RNA sequence: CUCCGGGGAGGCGGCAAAUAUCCUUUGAUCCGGAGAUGUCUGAAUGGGGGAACCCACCUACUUUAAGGUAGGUAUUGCAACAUGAAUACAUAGUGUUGCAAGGCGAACGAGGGGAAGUGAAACAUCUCAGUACCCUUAGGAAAAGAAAUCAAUUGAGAUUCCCUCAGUAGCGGCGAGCGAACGGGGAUCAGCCCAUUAAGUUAUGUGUGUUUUAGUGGAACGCUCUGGGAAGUGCGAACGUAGAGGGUGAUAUUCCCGUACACGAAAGGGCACACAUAAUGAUGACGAGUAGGGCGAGGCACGUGAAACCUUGUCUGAAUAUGGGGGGACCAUCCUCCAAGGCUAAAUACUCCUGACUGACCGAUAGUGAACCAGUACCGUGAGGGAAAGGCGAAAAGAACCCCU
RNA sequence: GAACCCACUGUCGUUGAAAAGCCAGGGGAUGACUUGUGGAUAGGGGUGAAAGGCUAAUCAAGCCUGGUGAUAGCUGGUUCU
RNA sequence: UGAGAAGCAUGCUGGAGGUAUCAGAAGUGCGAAUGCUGACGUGAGUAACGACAAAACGGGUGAAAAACCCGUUCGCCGAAAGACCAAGGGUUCCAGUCCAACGUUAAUCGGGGCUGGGUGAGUCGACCCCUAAGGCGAGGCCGAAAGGCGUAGUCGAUGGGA
């Protein structure tokens, strides 16, 4: 759990209707994370960097879309999301 | 025989041959001179930034070989050479040898 | 493979030639077989795969000399 | 900035490394949230980390 | 009617795959020929 | 990303404009040299596996929970050391440490195997042809090489390549076809050793010479007509150790980049010469299961022929300088050479590559399959097969605004 | 006698809905039965309750690339005055 | 204009190259080869529009409605024309917006174009432990070479294990 890895674990928040509803209602934060991050790594990174207490972490991977722009075909990268539940009322 | 960004030049070929101005920019083999080689752009109105379009006028670049440095002493076109005076390399007029008058 | 340890003889190629002079590929094989020799200096039997010409050379020069010569060429005997 | 970092010692360099990494993460999160106009500081920090690592390798 | 191609990924990989080609000498020559020709895909 | 050198007003790679933010005379972008970093698969080498994935162990440090960093852990061969059966000594076996190897790549070299279509106006000997193809393995070249060689006025003098000799002498179901040598003229030239061991070669380090990887300076033209635009018309000048080439709104030695010429290297590399320190040549000391012979095959231009000479699968088997080999069956005489141990440059073969230059070679159905995002699209389970598609304008100045829809 | 596995008769279809089918009838349907997944056998070879059948819509000797521009006393074609 | 293959002059278009004479070299002349590549005809606005389960009307939107949406009626399947899993496919899933091409007709609709979202596991499955047929295989045996087979082992579900 070195600090360099802890800083590379989290990438950014997710802005969407589902994420906003979860945040407003159930104390759940949605993050984009590194594709190789584990649940324990995400938990420790969140605890160290945001000063909160984590109950459990749920993760999912969505494969990148393949689109044809111009005459060439390209593919986007895979994305991993983390649903982090905070204890009581936090953040 | 370089030409720089602040020089006073005179056009030696083209539709505007015989006129002079101040160099505005130099990129690759093309040069823009203030107040010469004007073109009319039909700018379409821009949706995202407003600022409705219209007919505007702006300068267009010429080939660098079509302009020549202007010699302030004689008001004639001239070529440019290099001379090592003191320890600094300097641009000189080829016709007379005087150092180029920085403007 | 069919190689003699003492002489290095191995199968070669040749022709069958008929009375009408038809030619066909064939092989010539060595007179190979296994034999055990008593090595006195080591008090043991050494098994070699060799030809009858190899046996004649062994009778001429002695077994220990041939064994030393073979060990000189990196053979494990 | 390279000479400024080179005048420094090893302990100070290894402290500045962690500080710059924390600042880089903060900048990334700020940009991802969207309250950032200038992005050149991200590149500045990204190059600073590389400079510090190069100097550390040179010194050790 | 039943046609000739009945796909199965495991069978495809075990018959025509990279390690299958690497296991034999003739398969290594197949890979050498495709590298020489410049194929963008070496194996299925 | 860092250091050194060059350069001196712009720059933030292209498709691909513009925007926005920036960097830069406190030396940017860029060019050359030396470093730093360098995920995963792949000989892949910790075990496995459906390539880019799954699962581990050991040690040192570090964390406080279920970890992190760094290193190590393949096989085979050789050397040393340890240990160790049947079995008493031993040996086999087992283990540790150190060193080396494996894979890829155009052609050329050397070796181990080796066709058929076709021709013979059919076809089996013969030809095709030791070709195509498969396998193993070097080097910048490889192989060969210093006479047990030729010749036949008693002369030449190691190997390799080219011209002649010559389509000759021969071989051949004497068919179709195959096809020398001696001698002469050239290219290049070189010999040295077998146990106290030579020439030579390869590495290492030093010292000289040469070259290479950025670069700097570099002459000299004005009027006039046509024209959208002058480099074109007419008149008169200049430079030339520079009238090669490319660009510029049409055709330029004097407009631009350059050209002849002169100058230039912090650092780094190549070649050559001399010196020094290793290694190697070198398990080899004059050549016995060898020369020769019987049987079966192969190679020699030479198909068993009057068939010498070379290699050997099988069976045998000398003399040893008062000796032995060859001179195309064989004998005698003459001449010539010394096998059964080695090393050796050049002249010769080739082009995946890098630089410069050239063409009575092509100009988009041509030239590479491919001038364009091509071994791609597409076809096939797979090996594999395999396209079409260049051109606005000098400059986007790429058509504001109005009208029908 | 349904599912399932077959394929005896007829009409239609034959530039088809389909490079072997639909419809109406037909046979077996606890067995020498039908079927999924994963394996083995490779070309003068395999496999065959045997038809020269099958071996990727290809079989009296599969497909691909090489020898190869095989050979053809045969057929066609061969460009201005 | 000449006996011919052809030559000469000139109007329009076009917008930068062409080339006498005499020599020299050839990828030097096309109507045919069921020749090769591209473009375009005739048949001809002809056949056909893919199960004979079936449609009708009112309102809405829209440039336009037999086919879209809402509503009221009618008909069809119901051991599959309904609901799931594996294999195979890979974004076809949901929302907004567009109608050139695609859809055997039109389309405002769509599995079509563009933009943005969506897959949450100690208990489900895989991974993991174990092995079948079979594969590979340290040493080993055999073989011109490439290689064949095989011991100890190590893999391999379609089977056993909370």
From Swiss-Prot, chain A:
One Gene Ontology cellular component annotation held by this UniProt entry: ribosome
Keyword field contains Chaperone: no
Pfam families linked: Ribosomal_L23
RNA-binding in keyword set: yes
Gene Ontology MF term list: rRNA binding; structural constituent of ribosome
GO biological process, one term: translation
Alphabetical list of InterPro entries matching this protein: Nucleotide-bd_a/b_plait_sf, Ribosomal_uL23-like, Ribosomal_uL23/eL15/eS24_sf
Keywords: Ribonucleoprotein, Ribosomal protein, RNA-binding, rRNA-binding
Superkingdom classification of source: Bacteria
PANTHER family found in the cross-reference section: 60S RIBOSOMAL PROTEIN L23A
HAMAP family hit by this protein: Ribosomal_uL23_B
Subunit text: Part of the 50S ribosomal subunit. Contacts protein L29, and trigger factor when it is bound to the ribosome.
Family: Belongs to the universal ribosomal protein uL23 family.
Physiological role: One of the early assembly proteins it binds 23S rRNA. One of the proteins that surrounds the polypeptide exit tunnel on the outside of the ribosome. Forms the main docking site for trigger factor binding to the ribosome.
Stated name of the protein: Large ribosomal subunit protein uL23
Lineage start: Bacteria, Pseudomonadati, Pseudomonadota, Gammaproteobacteria, Moraxellales
From Swiss-Prot, chain B:
Top-level taxonomic group: Bacteria
InterPro entries: KOW, Rib_uL2_dom2, Ribosomal_uL24, Ribosomal_uL24_CS, Ribosomal_uL24_KOW, Translation_prot_SH3-like_sf
A Gene Ontology term for the protein's cellular component: ribosome
Presence of keyword Ribonucleoprotein: yes
GO molecular function annotations of the record: rRNA binding; structural constituent of ribosome
Cited SMART domains: KOW
Keyword list, A-Z: Ribonucleoprotein, Ribosomal protein, RNA-binding, rRNA-binding
PROSITE patterns documented for this protein: RIBOSOMAL_L24 (PS01108)
Pfam families: KOW (PF00467), ribosomal_L24 (PF17136)
Gene Ontology annotations of biological process type: translation
Task of the protein: One of two assembly initiator proteins, it binds directly to the 5'-end of the 23S rRNA, where it nucleates assembly of the 50S subunit. One of the proteins that surrounds the polypeptide exit tunnel on the outside of the subunit.
Subunit relationships: Part of the 50S ribosomal subunit.
Family label: Belongs to the universal ribosomal protein uL24 family.
Name the record gives this protein: Large ribosomal subunit protein uL24
The species this protein was found in: Acinetobacter baumannii (strain AB0057)
Lineage: Bacteria, Pseudomonadati, Pseudomonadota, Gammaproteobacteria, Moraxellales
Swiss-Prot record, chain D:
One GO BP: translation
Entry keyword annotation includes Cell membrane: no
This protein's UniProt keywords: Ribonucleoprotein, Ribosomal protein
Lineage: superkingdom: Bacteria
InterPro entries assigned to the protein according to its UniProt record, in alphabetical order: Ribosomal_protein_uL29, Ribosomal_uL29, Ribosomal_uL29_sf
A GO cellular-component term linked to this record: cytosolic large ribosomal subunit
One Gene Ontology MF term: structural constituent of ribosome
UniProt KW Magnesium keyword: no
One of the Pfam families matching this protein, by short name: Ribosomal_L29
Family note: Belongs to the universal ribosomal protein uL29 family.
Descriptive protein name: Large ribosomal subunit protein uL29
Organism: Acinetobacter baumannii (strain AB0057)
Lineage: Bacteria, Pseudomonadati, Pseudomonadota, Gammaproteobacteria, Moraxellales
Originating gene: rpmC
